Symmetry: C2
Subunit: 50 residues, 2 copies
């Protein structure tokens, strides 16, 4: 029973809001690379230079 909601969908929608095409993505290998894989899988789809 995961009380924490999924943030991957929220982050991918905020990057699209500001119309970001090239940005840095620091990450900590603590909460898992799940959000990192979400922005990398969409990096090819929406053409981002992450």
């Amino acid at each position: 029973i995961q009380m924490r909601p999924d943030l991957k969908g929220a982050l991918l929608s905020l990057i699209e809001y500001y119309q970001w095409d090239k940005f840095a993505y620091l990450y900590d290998s603590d909460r898992g690379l799940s959000t990192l894989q979400a922005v990398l899988d969409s990096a090819a789809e929406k053409k981002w230079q992450v």
Copy 2:
């Protein structure tokens, strides 16, 4: 005592051999994302577009 040698250094050297500045990295979250972080950490150090 894991008998498998580290492939991260070998792949990072092979990419540097062919002089690859832009390539695709098809990974599976099975053997861990250790090689994926290795090519992503070098993606900014050596200025790749993975």
